[PDB]
Structures are given as structure tokens and as C-alpha cells.
């Protein structure tokens with residue numbers, strides 16, 4: 001029993017973290033086989049950030065301008081190239097600690113673990129959901145760029161995120177491992193607005209099932225609702241519209257507790273209109289939306305890697 | 306910017322997790338040098354648990370009744386001894402992945418990372434605080450016993466907790482790595498009550514500093530308070546009394562922000578008396594007490 005925000009064990013990702021220095025900028029790099037991936041803004045000076053021409057900036061750099069350090073040993077850069085917003089530095093040594101991996105582009109609503117790093121040394125691990133407006137609510141300071149987001153499938157690490165910048169709301173933005181930003185953001189220090197955020201309805205439903213499995217039952221009522229009727233309420237409270245795909249994804253949890261998805265939607269519908277009235281659910285005074293139906297199932301089956 | 310409940314990187318501890326089986330019971334063990342540490346209740350049947358005589362039960366077990374596995378490698382058990390509520394299994398191989406380590410008994414109010422494990426394999430990592438009543442609010446299922454709590458200081462792993470059981474209220478109990486339970490608990494399946502819990506006042510203040518460093522400042526008022534008057538209010542709302550030692554520990558945060566501890570206690574006094582009025586601090590609708598001043602400084 002008990003329900004907690006839990007991150008994947010970071011060991012396999014810790015063995016891939018290196019420090020990448022160019023000029024006065026020092027950030028983190030991901031060393032897989034004989035390539036070190038890092039954000040391309042590492043080649044900028046504080047002034048360049050305002051409006052960089054990355055192609056021209058990279059032309060002025062050579063392999064000797066990139067100081068790559070794996071622990072106490074310096075790695076030699078023998079080639080460099082730019083793939084979207086990512087810099088790929090070829091090194092002369094392949095990472096002997098390279099795990100089985102893949103590069104994946106996650107969807108909004110999906111979660112991942114972030115291994116926050118500074119000077120190529122891991123400092124902490126936490127779980128994030130990719131918000132519907134393609135930002136993340138992380139904890140990142142100067143030097144944290146190049147820190148990666150990932151999920152594990154027993155043996156294989158699916159790298160889905162690399163940290164690049166922080167936006168007005170204190171929210172974070174970054175790319176997949178091919179350098180394509182999530183959202184409408186650019187790696188330039190100019191004002192940029194993230195869209196209006198929305199609550200991940202399917203994740204709130206998943207978390208209400210986790211509450212039932214754990215003994216928190218007070219919010220359960222005898223009503224049901226239509227996917228269409230519920231969406232009229234969800235739109236008023238800024239919740240993402242619920243689809244049949246979402247209902248099918250929630251099937252395993254619904255089957256385990258014997259509570260139908262439309263029945264849980266009716267319980268959620270009343271929680272949005274009447275509020276929680278000072279009561280808590282799983283130790284929280286708000287409705288949580290950063291647990292996927294898969295995060296809940298994993299923590300209700302003991303899935304190991 | 307951003308403030309998150311963050312666990313330490315688990316790689317160093319993952320290399321120490323092994324599977325320990327005794328009869329039909331399978332749980333986790335901690336392999337450091339040539340010794341595997343695990344809960345002593347691994348030797349119990351579902352029947353023994355109700356009222357175990359561990360001394361008599363362990364007498365009936367030999368080294369061969371303990372199967373220890375690290376990955377697909379079988380470690381040969383060549384010795385066994387019981388220290389308090391912990392079993393120490395001597396194996397024929399020293400763990401080559403043994404980090405620099407120490408065993409620590411943490412104080413109530415302090416935090417640690419838990420590497421949750423099943424079948425000797427790591428499942429996930431989360432941060433916990435040892436409550437004033439010596440329980441933790443974890444996420445542990447059947448087979449999670451043996452999973453450990455730890456802190457990391459650069460290269461050294463300070464192991465502070467080993468999971469043993471779940472209490473009537475859904476909370477968790479366990480021992481330090483010497484087998485001594487935190488709190489009044491015993492490894493027997495009988496009803497046991499954890500005391501009335503209290504809020505960790507020094508941690509709530511550290512979290513208020515974290516909020517100000519992040520731009521959440523609506524709760525900051527122009528008032529100040531004394532230690533004696535703040536403690537009169539804190540007593541009413543079931544908070545631990547704030548001491549000069551607590552004020553001293555808040556020093557680095559107080560200096561980094563330029564906000565006196567007694568000015569922050571006036572903000573906290575008004576938050577307790579008037580309530581939060583549906584507002585949030587760092588995305589939370591309640592006052593959080595599971596971040597120590599050190600946890601906050603580490604992320605600021």
C-alpha cells in the first residue's frame with residue numbers, strides 16, 4: 001500500500017552523463033556509443049543568445065573548442081555536427097557503459113524521469129509529465145542543460161527529452177534526442193509564450209483509481225455520465241476532453257476495482273463543481289494529473305527493470 | 306527555477322541489491338563487501354509471523370536454506386547471524402560494485418531516498434521523511450522488504466533505513482542497518498499503533514524559503530514575531546516547538562534571501578491562523594513539511 005510520485009532507477013543513465021565545455025559555457029552531454037549529445041546553445045556567449053545564427057557560430061568552432069570530461073578522464077572530440085537544436089560531438093572512445101537504448105518522441109500527457117545534472121555529475125532524479133502545452137514543471141538551475149528525460153522498459157532506456165531552457169512561468173522547455181523542440185519554442189533568448197495549459201483528464205482519472213486501490217473512497221458516488229456530457233463540464237474547468245481511446249487505456253484499472261470509467265467520470269464531475277471541501281485524496285488537497293494509467297498500474301503490480 | 310521533491314541518483318545502491326529466498330519467502334537484500342543484509346522475517350512462514358520466536362526459528366535454518374541471487378549469479382552462503390531484527394548472510398564473494406558507505410541512524414525530521422525493489426531488482430526511487438512518530442509514508446507492496454533508504458554525500462552512501470512492514474494506518478516501519486527499529490515497532494504481525502504525529506516546523510520554514518527563492522511570495526507579510534510567541538501558536542496547530550538550534554540551521558537560507566527567521570515565522574503564524582484560503586504555495590494547497598533546510602539549499 002501507499003502511492004508516491006516515483007522515478008525510474010537512474011543507474012543506466014548515470015553512466016552516460018558527461019560534462020561538455022565550450023568557451024565559458026559548461027553544460028551536460030549524453031554519451032552513447034561514440035557520440036556525445038548536448039544542446040547547441042553551448043557554442044553561444046551570453047550576448048549570442050539574444051539572436052544566434054547557429055550555422056555561422058558552429059562554422060567558427062573546431063573540435064578543440066569542445067572540452068568533454070567523463071569523470072576525471074578527458075574524452076577527445078574527433079568530429080562535430082548539428083542536428084536541429086542538438087550538437088553531436090563524435091568522440092574517439094565508445095561508452096563502455098552504453099545501455100540498450102532508443103530515442104523516442106513522447107506525447108503530451110506522458111511522463112518521464114529527469115536525471116538533473118550539473119558539470120556532468122548527476123545530482124537528483126524526479127518524475128515529470130509533458131504538459132499539453134509542451135512545457136515541463138521541473139527544477140533546473142544554470143548548468144543543468146543537457147540533462148535528460150527517460151523511461152525504462154526493463155533493459156532498454158527510451159530517451160525522450162533533453163533540457164534546453166526556462167520560460168516566463170518558471171516552466172521548462174527542451175527537445176527530443178533528434179533536437180526537435182517539444183512545442184513552439186526556439187533556442188533564442190527572446191520572450192516566448194507557452195500556450196494556456198490544460199489538465200490531463202485521463203491522468204486525474206488514473207489517480208482517482210489509485211486512491212480507490214489505497215482505501216480513499218469518500219468521493220465515489222452512484223452516478224454515471226456520458227463521454228459527451230462529461231466533456232461539457234471538463235471544458236468549463238480547463239480539462240482536456242476525454243475520448244474513447246482514454247476510456248480504453250483506463251480499462252485495466254476499471255477492471256481491477258470494479259468501477260466503470262463513466263462512473264469515475266461522474267465522481268470527478270462532482271469534485272470539480274463542489275470542490276474537495278477541505279478533504280484530501282492520497283495526501284493531496286488538489287486533483288493530481290501527472291500520473292498516467294501506466295504509472296498507477298506499475299505502482300499497483302510492482303513492475304521492476 | 307522550480308522546486309521538486311527529488312531523490313538522490315540510485316546507481317550506487319542499485320549495484321548492491323540482491324534477491325534473498327528462504328523457503329517460500331522471497332525479499333530483497335543489501336550486498337556490501339562479503340555480507341548480505343536483509344529483514345529477519347525472511348525465515349518466517351505466514352503462520353510464524355503472528356508470534357515469532359526468531360531465536361528458535363533461526364536455529365532450525367542452515368546456510369543452504371538461504372538462496373541469494375545477484376542477477377543470474379548465485380552467491381554461496383557460508384555463514385549467518387542475527388543482529389537485532391536484521392539477518393547478516395556471509396557470502397563467498399565480495400561485491401565488486403560496493404560503494405564507499407556507512408550505516409547511519411537518522412533523526413526524526415530528516416529525509417532519505419528509498420530505492421523500492423522486488424525480486425532483488427530496482428523498481429523506482431522516491432524521497433521520504435522520517436516522521437516525529439518514526440513512520441514513513443512510502444509505497445511498498447508484497448516483496449518490497451529489504452529495500453533501503455539512503456543519503457549520498459558526493460561519493461559516500463549513508464544507508465539509514467531498511468523496509469520491514471506496513472502499519473494499520475497505511476504508513477511504513479523499518480530498521481536502521483544494525484536491525485534496530487525506528488520507533489516502538491516489533492517485527493510481529495500484531496496490531497501496533499504509531500503515536501500521534503506532529504508537523505516538522507523547521508521543514509515548513511525551509512519550504513517557505515524555497516517558495517520565496519522561486520517567486521512565490523504572496524504569504525510574505527511586513528510583521529515579525531518572537532520565538533516564544535511563534536511557539537504558542539505552533540503548539541495549538543500541532544507543530545513541533547521551534548528551538549534556537551532550528552533557527553541556527555535556517556541560517557544559510559535566511560542569509561541567501563535576506564529574510565530573518567522570525568520574519569518568516571510571522572508569515573507562518575498568519576498562514577496557520579487564517580489558513581491558506583484556497584491559495585497555493587509552490588503548487589501545493591497544504592503546508593509541506595518533508596523538505597529539510599539542506600534539501601532546500603541543495604536545490605537553490
Ligand SMILES: *C(=N)[C@H](C[C@@H]1CCNC1=O)NC(=O)[C@@H]1C[C@@H](C(F)(F)F)CN1C(=O)[C@@H](NC(=O)OC)C(C)(C)C
Pocket residue numbers: 027041049140141142143144145146163164165166167168172186187188189190191192306
Ligand atoms: C541551461 N543550462 C540553461 C537552463 C536554464 C538556466 C536557468 N533556468 C534554466 O532552466 N539554459 C539557458 O540558460 C537557456 C539558453 C538560452 C536559449 F534558450 F538558448 F535561448 C537562454 N536560456 C534560458 O533558459 C533563458 N530562457 C529563455 O530565453 O527562454 C525564452 C533564461 C532562463 C532567461 C536564461
Ligand SMILES: *C(=N)[C@H](C[C@@H]1CCNC1=O)NC(=O)[C@@H]1C[C@@H](C(F)(F)F)CN1C(=O)[C@@H](NC(=O)OC)C(C)(C)C
Pocket residue numbers: 001332346354445446447448449450451469470471472473477491492493494495496497
Ligand atoms: C515485506 N516484504 C512486507 C512489506 C509489506 C507488504 C505490504 N506492504 C508492506 O509494506 N512486510 C510484511 O509482510 C511484514 C512481515 C510481518 C512482520 F512485520 F514481520 F510481522 C508482517 N508484515 C506486515 O507488513 C504486516 N503488517 C503488520 O503486521 O504490521 C504490524 C501486513 C502489512 C499486515 C502484512
